[PDB]
């Protein structure tokens, strides 16, 4: 046969992301001294559109504690953050929307966003628009905070991991129909070359496991083993079940 499209997507030639219009990586302030012993006050200079990102970004300016310098950070804006607002990042920062408290400092039921997976990685979880993390609970000995992730997953992470308070701005985005191949085209034109999607069943057998036949049919089961290989993993990978499901997420 032939190397199939999902195989070709890994060589990263035409499938690299279109990063021209982007405003920089949206990362928290580095965990230096003030973020873990006190707080530091920065100012939201502007809230901007980042191409490919559904959530607005916040350009927050902080003072350098050791040098006469202004350090600009690129935050993921939460709902309600505005220009001219003061952001307080640190262990002693208050439970206000836009502040970057540690999970140990925030109490249970807190709505946090841009939560660090490990302390100091500058934000990994709940970064897409409208998304948030629930602080389920704490465990002070061997300090670990249990949190609920946007997918409903339980995660035990360090009590030192930072996170902004609130929900990510730009929510409700997927509630609007695109209505147009043109709108999909413009959506993906600045994300990556992943659109349009030809159906594998409409290809030839050289091009896909599903291609070929005198009728457009998959032929064999479309559920593929986790132990399958590249070129085989086309369909429903390691599916526990299939078909329409009668239920809700239930976290």
């Amino acid at each position: 046969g032939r190397v199939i499209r999902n195989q070709r997507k890994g060589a990263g030639s035409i499938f690299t992301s279109h990063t021209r219009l982007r405003q920089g990586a949206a990362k928290l302030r580095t965990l230096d001294y003030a973020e873990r012993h006190g707080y530091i006050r920065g100012i939201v200079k502007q809230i901007v559109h980042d191409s490919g990102r559904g959530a607005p970004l916040a350009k927050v300016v902080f003072r350098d504690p050791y040098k006469y310098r202004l350090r600009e950070e690129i935050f993921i804006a939460n709902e309600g953050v505005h220009t001219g607002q003061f952001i307080y990042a640190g262990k002693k920062a208050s439970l206000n929307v836009g502040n970057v408290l540690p999970l140990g400092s925030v109490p249970e039921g807190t709505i946090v966003s841009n939560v660090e997976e490990k302390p100091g990685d500058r934000g990994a979880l709940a970064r897409a628009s409208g998304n948030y993390v629930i602080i389920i609970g704490h465990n002070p000995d061997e300090n670990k905070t249990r949190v609920r992730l946007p997918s409903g997953a339980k995660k035990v992470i360090s009590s030192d991991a930072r996170g902004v308070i609130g929900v990510i701005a730009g929510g409700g985005r997927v509630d609007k129909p695109l209505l147009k191949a043109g709108r999909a085209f413009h959506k993906y034109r600045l994300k990556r070359n992943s659109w349009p999607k030809t159906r594998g069943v409409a290809m030839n057998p050289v091009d896909h496991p599903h291609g070929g036949g005198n009728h457009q049919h998959i032929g064999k089961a479309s559920t593929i083993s986790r132990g399958a290989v590249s070129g085989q993993k086309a369909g429903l990978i390691a599916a526990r079940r299939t078909g329409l499901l009668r239920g809700s997420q239930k976290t």
Binding site: Y33, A34, G38, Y39, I40, R63, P65, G90
Partner: protein
């Protein structure tokens, strides 16, 4: 006085630019510096078998000073003195046709690892000083055992550079006296008594004693805290 004010800068966690504190504890040291420090640290952390760590048992400063003073009195002859001696022997064999023995028998400290090891094997060596800084330890790690076998007093001393200065080099790694003058034979015997008291008779204990196994400052504090909260009942 009327024109001067009180500024004081508040160096709180978010108030004023921090002053130029000494950041020597946080320097990004070069790779070779880091390897030096970490090599020493790893050698300390690992349980070093008794064959090593019988070194780093160097004799104390006072007796080291006496021993190196005696050896410096027994120091070899410089190049200028060697040329003088050779010229005087040339003149002697020219005028009296002497049998090259007008010059007295020398009394010098024997150096060179192979030379000194052969001297110990032959039991010629009165006293042998073994440095502790030799980069491959296997060069001298067998020397205490050899000296114990041959009954020659040995002392692990501090400084291959010191031994090199002693024998007019940069590094000797070993020194030895095989013959002495009567004027300081008594001094050498007194020195040998204490050197043997430290090394030759405690040899079996030194060969049973295991070194190393020391943890870092934070680790010591951690086990201290754990023991304190365990026995605090």
């Amino acid at each position: 006085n009327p024109l001067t004010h009180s500024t004081p800068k508040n160096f709180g966690i978010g108030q004023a630019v921090q002053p130029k504190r000494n950041l020597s504890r946080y320097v990004k040291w070069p790779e070779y510096v880091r390897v030096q420090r970490q090599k020493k640290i790893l050698s300390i952390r690992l349980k070093v078998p008794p064959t090593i760590a019988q070194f780093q048992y160097t004799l104390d400063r006072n007796t080291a000073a006496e021993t190196f003073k005696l050896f410096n009195k027994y120091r070899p002859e410089t190049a200028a003195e060697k040329k003088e001696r050779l010229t005087k022997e040339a003149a002697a064999v020219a005028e009296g046709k002497s049998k090259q023995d007008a010059s007295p028998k020398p009394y010098a400290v024997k150096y060179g690892l192979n030379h000194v090891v052969a001297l110990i094997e032959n039991k010629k060596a009165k006293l042998v000083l073994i440095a502790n800084d030799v980069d491959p330890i296997e060069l001298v790690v067998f020397l205490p055992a050899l000296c114990k076998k041959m009954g020659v007093p040995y002392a692990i001393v501090k400084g291959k550079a010191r031994l090199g200065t002693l024998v007019n080099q940069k590094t000797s790694a070993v020194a030895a006296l095989t013959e002495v003058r009567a004027e300081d034979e008594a001094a050498l015997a007194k020195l040998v008594s204490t050197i043997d008291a430290n090394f030759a008779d405690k040899y079996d204990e030194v060969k049973k004693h295991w070194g190393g196994g020391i943890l870092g400052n934070k680790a010591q504090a951690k086990m201290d805290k754990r023991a304190k909260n365990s026995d605090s009942a």
